[PDB]
Ligand binder design. Structure first.
Ligand SMILES: CCCCCCCCCCCCCCCCCC(=O)OC[C@H](CO[C@@H]1O[C@H](CO[C@H]2O[C@H](CO)[C@H](O)[C@H](O)[C@H]2O)[C@H](O)[C@H](O)[C@H]1O)OC(=O)CCCCCCCCCCCCCCCCC
Ligand SMILES: CCCCCCCCCCCCCCCCCC(=O)OC[C@H](CO[C@@H]1O[C@H](CO[C@H]2O[C@H](CO)[C@H](O)[C@H](O)[C@H]2O)[C@H](O)[C@H](O)[C@H]1O)OC(=O)CCCCCCCCCCCCCCCCC
Ligand code: CLA
Ligand code: CLA
Ligand code: CLA
Ligand code: CLA
Ligand code: CLA
Ligand SMILES: CCCCCCCCCCCCCCCCCC(=O)OC[C@H](CO[C@@H]1O[C@H](CO)[C@H](O)[C@H](O)[C@H]1O)OC(=O)CCCCCCCCCCCCCCCCC
Ligand SMILES: CCCCCCCCCCCCCCCC(=O)OC[C@H](CO[C@@H]1O[C@H](CS(=O)(=O)O)[C@@H](O)[C@H](O)[C@H]1O)OC(=O)CCCCCCCCCCCCCCC
Ligand SMILES: CC1=C(/C=C/C(C)=C/C=C/C(C)=C/C=C/C=C(C)/C=C/C=C(C)/C=C/C2=C(C)CCCC2(C)C)C(C)(C)CCC1
Ligand code: OEX
Ligand SMILES: [Cl-]
Ligand SMILES: [Cl-]
Ligand SMILES: [Fe+2]
Lengths: 56, 32, 240, 336, 35, 112, 449, 30, 37, 30, 35
């Protein structure tokens, strides 16, 4: 046909991914920043006992 | 029109039935 | 995809894919072009899919030649002519007659020039009557006016409905600018198209090929000169 | 040191010592409202004309296409798209995106997602400064009204082409067409919204003048009275008793508010509740609930129609609806 | 166009994961009020 | 205090304000370069390069872009008299924008 | 009763007095749950008494009877109402149960204990006890999970539910094969909310609906058992506020989204909200108009395919932006509409005009002409046209009442989220009464902020 | 009478006139 | 309409939906009776 | 031509917004 | 707290030279500018 499309306007794809690299973008960027948060979780407090939130 | 009149009688017996709780409970007792 | 691969899909699977804008390719069948049996055929599922839109644009420069330039498409996927009914006749030697009567045989389409000029047109083959051998079914269709007669401009002027003058300029309501207020010309022009049958599948009664048409663009109800647009691409039909 | 990379980033994002506070809503608010700001200014100036109505006539809204500040607008998305999601990457060319009203849906998606997070960080800085939270609840009323015009009314009508145009004269078209199709003037929630902005302008002038007319004499007549207040002074620079005891004389004594804290709650609650209703009134007419239709309501004996002022509003209403979107309608009922 | 879509999905998920893990990184303790 | 012709000598003693005040001049020079190239493109007539060329039309900074390779435009036209099929990013308007984007970046650096 | 100076709450915020009063708060909810069941009993019998069989269910202002009709009680093929007595039993069983819920709600509000902590330790709770809060959260998920299995049992075993997509017209269909495929069920959830997707408002058949409630039934039974036997993990201690007003604000933001979802659910969907009972959707009535004049004018000797409109796009049939043959006009925006009267005319490549020139059925033009004159536009005094329409009919669609009420309720409960989540986060921090006036934290900050 | 020279005259007046007025009224108040 | 063994009780049914509007009003009467303490 | 004047008035208004935030007269306490 | 802060001064005799200079240049050159 005349031009080139991505062809996903009304297809209902999961999180709008149609190249599998887009799903690894979703997992890579979430996973990179989950890991930065997880390693940095030692500076956030060890809320280990049961009554250890901001409560009233 | 008895079907319209009973609807008004049913309205008055119910629209009083709330304050009649509040009035009677104010007179005798009063723990409201 | 073939015709049977399209019809083996549900509506929600073909929706939003661009498959619905395409003619069925004729994968089975050979290019021998003679085992097509002579005689008359009423021609249904006749569909035409273009591949290029080039317009005869005058050159930007002063001594430049006027050729057909590559364009990019503004309307999205609304340009395939599809499901046209008509009659198809072939001779004993190879002389063929293509004719369509009803169907979706027009497609309004805006296309943009390299330079920023948006030329709009309706891609049609409507009321086609073409004769000739299976490499060329040369004939002429008509191009109707791109807007109807009851179309109204931004100032409310139009052919059938409308003011017929510039009402917001009450002293110069009718003046020497009556080219675009006093006449809204909706005269239909003519276009020529060349079909060439390329593949025959006689066991199913399916024939396909390549088409080439040239048609006028748009006159803005008689306010700009219409430009010539060369449309090429594929086509497909079902003899049955 | 002991602090990680993420922990020093959290103490910078939530830092109250930034000049503009960021917060965790500001890592959404800033890259959204810089995206929508940059593509607004480029499309208000230089966008090519837009097929708003889906009928393949383009509508110009840009300064470079013969528009001024009043008549220029970022044109809403095409009617052929509807509520479909049309980003840049779903177009073939960038010019097809520009032709079909693509810039509008990119502004509106980032603007709405930016004002939802602007509301979130008005909460957040209040929590970081030790404040009570509900300035965000007050800002939810222009947020809901922005959400009604750009999101909810397109959702109800089925196209972003029915969303409000991003411009001055495009807004006016949006209002005039709305009153023809929904009769917004005869809707009580718009009536309450007008009472919120007429009351909110009355009360801004009322509270603004009683405080100004009760200023303690601190300066001379050679210097403005606004120099009698020092920023950070702990005394209270006007006389609330003299202001109350004046407005008490003016209408009624118990009509006034002797409580300045109760005064400023009512001063907040009259516009915010009024705009809450006209944001919902716009959102109920999004679903075509419409305004009161009292047309041919007064009828005399022998069954004949006496006109009212509502019948004259209808003559002004049905003049607009026979002329709005003048080429779109092939069929006699504007159901879209 | 796909290069733009990959880039926007890296960008948007960068800022969404800043949002989510920011409130998971002990937001309710970032008050001036002591208890 | 100082006379009117001596005001800029507050910068002779501190080098940090000397960065900031050359950055503002550099933002104005490239801010002129993009603005003059936008003005010249908006009035240039690329129709006849043979008998109405750029020096005939008053173009001053357009022969300096064209001297170092920039021959194509985002309006399709070129200088040699043909259509640009791929203008690229380094058009006349791309460079007229690349100097304005640099003008605002140098502006912010001067405020810093 | 209780007063201001012993609580610090005025009369206008006096339900906030019973935050830490577990028994009073229980009677507050059970008496309120009496009202929801009382309204559902009373408004059901109001709609049974005012039901007229000569008129459609959507014409009469009925919003609760289409819910019992969608379950398939008392409906026939094509949405015809067989009997009204199944709608009467649903009204009385709620109206009688409301007195039982009303009794114990009045009981625990007046006579029952103020805090049921020391006498009834199973029901007692402190808001900061994170084990007991998940324990009560787990009990109610099992109730929501077993409630979701009632819809599955009624569709699979107890007579079936109304399928508007059934072959032979819409009637009650036992859903023998509910869709338990996780790629299909969790494909709605990750779908985009925009045009052509509609997040979960496009669920197009009842097999995905009933098979989806198998998933929501099992996950809530499993997620209830999960919260009974666990406490929130330390990352969840770190993120939440653990007060009773916080738990309210968590529920208010969750339920304010659900009001927005059911707003767009009843407006767009016609499978869980069948058009025989709720009337046509916004998209359905606008597509019904273009279909009605495509059959009117085709019988008057006009080719509906070759007919060019005044703009040049096609008056009756045009092409979708993804290439489907759709209806022309301003209803090009609703081209992704699917309806059970329209889908018999639709092939792969959009609508099939060969099928549409020869095989328009007489029942389809009956139903599409009904939907055009019952478009979901009306007025606030229930007039029933565009705003430029005279007082002739008496109609506002239930879809127009269901969407408009639940956007407003969904909007205010988002405001109630912003109120209580701001307050509970600030009241747990200590500064909900105001600035301390001794250590104002702005005064310990560096100026030129 | 051109658009340039009528406003180039006005800018060569007012931009240096007012600049000198900015510096004088600054100075005469000291 | 209702089943015909209950249609004489249809006058009571037309009053039954508005009753939860009276329940929010009863909270204001009860608070007026204790003088809004 | 007038579009050049329009953008200069819009850039000039956004300039004052930039100076009113980042070069405001700072509120001195006490 | 920049130590390099100076003030500009312009007395009225320098105002009268400056205003004269830009009017005499406008008397001179504008005959050529209007051409
Ligand atoms: C088309 C597809 C689209 C994409 C899919 C979209 C849907 C995705 C939805 C998935 C579900 C998401 C739910 C995540 C919940 C996270 C909640 C959380 O904050 O979770 C918080 C908890 C915290 O856990 C606890 O964290 C603690 C932190 O300790 C630290 O601090 C302690 C003191 O506090 C001690 O000092 C200790 O020594 C120190 O280590 C302890 O370590 C505990 O052991 C530990 O259990 O995290 C945990 O439980 C585990 C968290 C879950 C696992 C996360 C995996 C992330 C992805 C991995 C894959 C990446 C791929 C990369 C690709 C690269 C190439 C491109
Ligand atoms: C990313 C985040 C996006 C946030 C919401 C954007 C909504 C855009 C939209 O177009 O959403 C609309 C969608 C519905 O989408 C529609 O869904 C329809 C599904 O129907 C289809 O499928 C049905 C199946 O029976 C029918 O058969 C029908 O015929 C067929 O057309 C169609 O696909 C439509 O094209 C499609 O637009 O709503 C939904 O998905 C439900 C989602 C919730 C909507 C919330 C709206 C209100 C938002 C809050 C505003 C107030 C805020 C206040 C702040 C103070
Ligand atoms: C690279 C070039 C350069 C640089 C950095 C300087 C820098 C300086 N000069 Mg020198 N100067 C230069 C070129 C330069 N000059 C040239 C070419 C001349 C000959 C005309 C002079 C003659 C000169 C004198 C006679 C004096 C200075 C002085 C100064 C100092 C203060 C300037 C001031 O306050 O102006 C303030 C200027 C104004 C407030 C307005 C000036 C407006 C005029 C009309 C120009 C209009 C601006 C125009 C838009 C820009 C176009 C310029 C063009 C080159 C592109 C400063 C150290 C003074 C000094 O040393 O102080 C002790 C001093 O007395 N300069
Ligand atoms: C759904 C609405 C609802 C519910 C269930 C409650 C429930 C409650 N409120 Mg709240 N309240 C409400 C709305 C509600 N309120 C509203 C709208 C306001 C603002 C006006 C208030 C303002 C308010 C204040 C200011 C206070 C309460 C308090 C209370 C509690 C004690 C009640 C009491 O002592 O009354 C005694 C009153 C009566 C006995 C009067 C008679 C009312 C009865 C219950 C009506 C029952 C009628 C019904 C038909 C009976 C059916 C019986 C069955 C067998 C069929 C109670 C749990 C108090 C509290 O916090 O306690 C610590 C308190 O101080 N309320
Ligand atoms: C929220 C869900 C909901 C929905 C979608 C509907 C929808 C409908 N109802 Mg039902 N109804 C509801 C709740 C609902 N109702 C409740 C809670 C009750 C009990 C009171 C009833 C009782 C009821 C009866 C008795 C009847 C209906 C009828 C109707 C129909 C027409 C209604 C009409 O004309 O409204 C007109 C529009 C309004 C009244 C606007 C409401 C706006 C409210 C009042 C807020 C106003 C804002 C204001 C400032 C706040 C007030 C407080 C402030 C002063 C402090 C329609 C199908 C009628 C029908 O068709 O029967 C077959 C009918 O006879 N309803
Ligand atoms: C009424 C429902 C309800 C409620 C209120 C809770 C409440 C809670 N659960 Mg429980 N849970 C429930 C139902 C519920 N649960 C059910 C039904 C299941 C079974 C599936 C579980 C299984 C479960 C587990 C296994 C765990 C919890 C945990 C928790 C706690 C923290 C949850 C949290 O912060 O999520 C925050 C959510 C996220 C960070 C996910 C990101 C969300 C974004 C929006 C993306 C979501 C994508 C997803 C596919 C949905 C897409 C559609 C969406 C856009 C609508 C909290 C006490 C945790 C805990 O401490 O329990 C001990 C825990 O580990 N829950
Ligand atoms: C299920 C939801 C829920 C629950 C349990 C609570 C519970 C509570 N709220 Mg919250 N609130 C909610 C939703 C909820 N609220 C929502 C949705 C909003 C936004 C509108 C608010 C806004 C809000 C404020 C602003 C305040 C509370 C307060 C309170 C406390 C006492 C309230 C009281 O005595 O009422 C007394 C009842 C009245 C005075 C009568 C009000 C009736 C109004 C006018 C509506 C009338 C109904 C009308 C038909 C609706 C028209 C709208 C329609 C068009 C949709 C209590 C903890 C107060 C508090 O102490 O904070 C902790 C407080 O100041 N709430
Ligand atoms: C206030 C509340 C307002 C009401 C909210 C009601 C619920 C609305 C949200 C739920 C429905 C959407 C579910 C997820 C859908 C989805 O995955 O989108 C997926 C879509 C799909 O995106 C498109 O998909 C198409 C295929 O259908 C094509 O592939 C397109 O190329 C692609 O762009 O992406 C988006 O639309 C944008 C999502 C990113 C923006 C999210 C903002 C988050 C802000 C922070 C949140 C922290 C938590
Ligand atoms: C490019 C953006 C868009 C352009 C918009 C065009 C219209 C702009 C209208 C607004 C003009 C400014 C209004 C008044 C500002 C003010 O008084 O600031 C007061 C502050 C004083 O603060 C103090 O300044 C002190 C230095 S001093 O005292 O000034 O020497 C410093 O030490 C101290 O820290 C500080 O507190 O000034 C400064 O900080 C720096 C001097 C600002 C000089 C004026 C700039 C004029 C605009 C030129 C921009 C380029 C234009 C050409 C290109 C388009
Ligand atoms: C006297 C005279 C002279 C001189 C003149 C001059 C010197 C002029 C100047 C001029 C100039 C010097 C100009 C300039 C301009 C500039 C501009 C115009 C700029 C702009 C910029 C911008 C606009 C930017 C923006 C931005 C930012 C801010 C950031 C980033 C982003 C953006 C891009 C947006 C001479 C000797 C020659 C002779 C004649 C006369
Ligand atoms: O989009 Mn804007 O305005 Ca809601 O009606 Mn139909 O569509 Mn359209 O016309 Mn009328
Ligand atoms: Cl219009
Ligand atoms: Cl139409
Ligand atoms: Fe005040």
């Amino acid at each position: 046909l005349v031009d080139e499309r991505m062809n996903g306007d009304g297809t209902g794809r999961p999180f709008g991914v149609n190249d599998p690299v887009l799903g690894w973008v979703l997992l890579g960027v979430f996973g990179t920043m989950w890991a930065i948060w997880f390693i940095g979780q030692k500076d956030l407090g060890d809320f280990e006992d049961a009554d250890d939130g901001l409560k009233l | 029109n008895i079907e319209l009149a009973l609807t008004l009688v049913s309205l008055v017996l119910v629209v009083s039935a709330g304050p009649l709780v509040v009035v009677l409970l104010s007179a005798r007792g009063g723990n409201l | 995809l073939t015709f049977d691969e399209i019809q083996g899909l549900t509506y929600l699977q073909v929706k939003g894919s661009g498959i619905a804008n395409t003619c069925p390719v004729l994968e089975s069948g050979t290019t021998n072009l003679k085992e097509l049996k002579a005689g008359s055929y009423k021609l249904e599922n006749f569909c035409i899919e273009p591949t290029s839109f080039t317009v005869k644009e005058e050159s930007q420069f002063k001594g430049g030649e006027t050729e057909f330039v590559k364009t990019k498409l503004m309307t999205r996927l609304t340009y395939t002519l599809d499901a046209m009914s008509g009659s198809f006749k072939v001779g004993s030697d190879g002389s063929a007659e293509l004719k369509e009567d009803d169907g979706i045989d027009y497609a309004a389409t805006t296309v943009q020039l390299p330079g920023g000029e948006r030329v709009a047109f309706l891609f049609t083959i409507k009321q086609f009557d073409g004769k000739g051998t299976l490499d060329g079914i040369k004939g002429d269709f008509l191009v109707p006016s791109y807007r109807g007669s009851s179309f109204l401009d931004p100032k409310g002027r139009g052919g059938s409905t409308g003011y017929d003058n510039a009402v917001a300029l009450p002293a110069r309501a009718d003046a020497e600018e009556l080219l675009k207020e006093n006449v809204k010309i909706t005269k239909a022009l003519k276009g020529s198209a060349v079909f060439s049958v390329a593949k025959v599948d006689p066991v199913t009664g399916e024939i396909a090929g390549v088409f080439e048409s040239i048609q006028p663009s748009d006159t803005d109800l008689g306010a700009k000169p219409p430009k010539d647009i060369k449309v090429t691409g594929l086509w497909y039909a079902q003899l049955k | 040191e002991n602090s990680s990379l993420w922990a020093r980033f959290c103490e910078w994002i939530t830092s109250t010592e930034n000049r503009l506070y960021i917060g965790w809503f500001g890592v959404i608010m800033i890259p959204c409202l810089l995206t929508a700001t940059s593509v607004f200014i480029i499309a208000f100036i230089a966008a090519p004309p837009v097929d708003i109505d889906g009928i393949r006539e383009p509508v110009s809204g840009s300064l470079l296409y013969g528009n001024n500040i009043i008549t220029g607008a970022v044109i809403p998305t095409s009617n052929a798209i509807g509520l479909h999601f049309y980003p840049i990457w779903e177009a073939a060319s960038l010019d097809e995106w520009l032709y079909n009203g693509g810039p509008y849906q990119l502004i509106v998606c980032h603007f709405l997602l930016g004002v939802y997070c602007y509301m979130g960080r008005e909460w957040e800085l209040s929590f970081r400064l030790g404040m009570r939270p509900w300035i965000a609840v007050a800002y939810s009323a222009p947020v809901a009204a922005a959400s009604a015009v750009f999101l909810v009314y397109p959702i109800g009508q089925g196209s972003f082409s029915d969303g409000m145009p991003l411009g001055i004269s495009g807004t006016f078209n949006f209002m005039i067409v709305f009153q023809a199709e929904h009769n917004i003037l005869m809707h009580p929630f718009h009536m309450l919204g007008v009472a919120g902005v007429f009351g909110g302008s009355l009360f801004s002038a009322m509270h603004g003048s009683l405080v100004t007319s009760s200023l303690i004499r601190e300066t001379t007549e050679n210097e403005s009275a606004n120099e009698g207040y020092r920023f950070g002074q702990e005394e209270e620079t006007y006389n609330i008793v003299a202001a109350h005891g004046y407005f008490g004389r003016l209408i009624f004594q118990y009509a006034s508010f002797n409580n300045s804290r109760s005064l400023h709650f009512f001063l907040a609650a009259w516009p915010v509740i009024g705009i809450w209703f006209t944001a919902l009134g716009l959102s109920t007419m999004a679903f075509n609930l419409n305004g009161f239709n009292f047309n041919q309501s007064v009828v005399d004996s022998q069954g004949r129609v006496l006109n009212t002022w509502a019948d004259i509003i209808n003559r002004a209403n049905l003049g607009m609806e026979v002329m709005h979107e003048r080429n779109a309608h092939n069929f006699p009922l504007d159901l879209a | 166009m796909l290069t733009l879509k990959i880039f926007v999905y890296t960008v948007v998920t960068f800022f969404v994961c800043l949002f989510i893990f920011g409130f998971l990184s002990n937001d309710p303790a970032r008050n001036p009020g002591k208890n | 205090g100082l006379p009117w012709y001596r005001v800029h000598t507050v910068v002779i003693n501190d080098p940090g304000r000397l960065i900031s005040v050359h950055l503002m001049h550099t933002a104005l020079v490239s801010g002129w370069a993009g603005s003059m190239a936008l003005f010249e493109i908006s009035v240039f007539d690329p129709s006849d390069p043979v008998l109405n060329p750029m020096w005939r039309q008053g173009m001053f900074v357009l022969p300096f872009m064209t001297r170092l390779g920039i021959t194509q435009s985002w309006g399709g036209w070129t200088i040699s008299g043909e259509t640009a099929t791929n203008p690229g990013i380094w058009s006349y308007e791309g460079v007229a924008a690349a100097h304005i984007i640099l003008s605002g970046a140098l502006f912010l650096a001067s405020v810093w | 009763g209780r007063d201001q100076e012993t609580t610090g709450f005025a009369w206008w915020s006096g339900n906030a007095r019973l935050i830490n009063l577990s028994g009073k708060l229980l009677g507050a909810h059970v008496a309120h749950a009496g009202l929801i069941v009382f309204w559902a009993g009373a408004m059901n019998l109001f709609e049974v008494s005012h039901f007229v069989p000569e008129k459609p269910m959507y014409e009469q202002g009925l919003i609760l009877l289409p819910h019992i009709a969608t379950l398939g009680y008392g409906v026939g093929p094509g949405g015809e109402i067989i009997d009204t007595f199944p709608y009467f039993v649903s009204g009385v069983l709620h109206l009688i149960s409301s007195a039982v819920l009303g009794f114990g709600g009045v009981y625990h509000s007046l006579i029952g204990p103020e805090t049921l902590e020391e006498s009834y330790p199973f029901f007692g709770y402190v808001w900061k006890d994170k084990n007991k809060m998940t324990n009560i959260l787990g009990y109610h998920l099992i109730m929501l999970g077993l409630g979701a299995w009632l819809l599955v049992w009624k569709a699979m075993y107890f007579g079936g539910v109304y399928d508007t997509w059934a072959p032979g017209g819409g009637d009650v269909r036992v859903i023998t094969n509910p869709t338990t495929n996780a790629a299909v069920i969790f494909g709605y959830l990750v779908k985009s909310p925009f045009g052509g997707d509609g997040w979960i408002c496009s669920v197009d058949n009842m097999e995905d609906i009933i098979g989806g409630h198998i998933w929501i039934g099992t996950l809530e039974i499993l997620g209830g058992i999960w919260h009974i036997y666990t406490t929130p993990w330390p990352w969840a201690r770190r993120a939440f506020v653990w007060s009773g007003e916080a738990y309210l604000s968590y529920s208010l933001g969750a339920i304010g989204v659900m009001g927005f979802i059911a707003c767009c659910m009843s407006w767009f969907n016609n499978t869980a909200y069948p058009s025989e009972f709720y009337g046509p959707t916004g998209p359905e009535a606008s597509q019904s108009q273009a279909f009605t004049f495509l059959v009117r004018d085709q019988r008057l000797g006009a080719n509906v395919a070759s007919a060019q409109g005044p703009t040049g796009l096609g008056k009756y049939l045009m092409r979708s932006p993804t290439g489907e043959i759709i209806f022309g006009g301003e209803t090009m925006r609703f081209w992704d509409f699917r309806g059970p009267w329209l889908e018999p005319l639709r092939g792969p490549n959009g609508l099939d005009l060969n099928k549409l020139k020869n095989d328009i059925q007489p029942w389809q033009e009956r139903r599409a002409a009904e939907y055009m004159t019952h478009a979901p536009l009306g007025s606030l005094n229930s007039v029933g046209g565009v705003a430029t329409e005279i007082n002739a009919v008496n109609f506002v669609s239930p879809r127009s009442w269901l969407a408009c009420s639940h956007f407003c309720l969904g909007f205010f409960f988002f405001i109630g989220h912003l109120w209580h989540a701001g307050r509970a986060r600030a009241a747990a921090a200590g500064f909900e009464k105001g600035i301390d006036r001794f250590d104002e934290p702005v005064l310990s900050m560096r100026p030129l902020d | 009478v051109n658009i340039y020279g009528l406003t180039a005259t006005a800018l060569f007046i007012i931009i240096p006139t007012s600049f000198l007025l900015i510096l004088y009224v600054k100075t005469a108040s000291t | 309409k209702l089943p015909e063994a209950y249609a004489p009780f249809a006058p009571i049914v037309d009053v039954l939906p508005v009753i939860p509007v009276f329940f929010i009003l009863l909270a204001f009467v009860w608070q007026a009776a204790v003088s809004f303490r | 031509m007038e579009a050049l004047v329009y953008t200069f008035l819009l850039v000039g208004t956004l300039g004052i917004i930039f100076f009113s935030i980042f070069f405001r007269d700072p509120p001195r306490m006490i | 707290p920049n130590p390099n802060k100076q003030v500009v001064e312009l007395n009225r005799t320098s105002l009268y030279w400056g205003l004269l200079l830009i009017f005499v240049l406008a008397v001179l050159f504008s005959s050529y500018i209007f051409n």
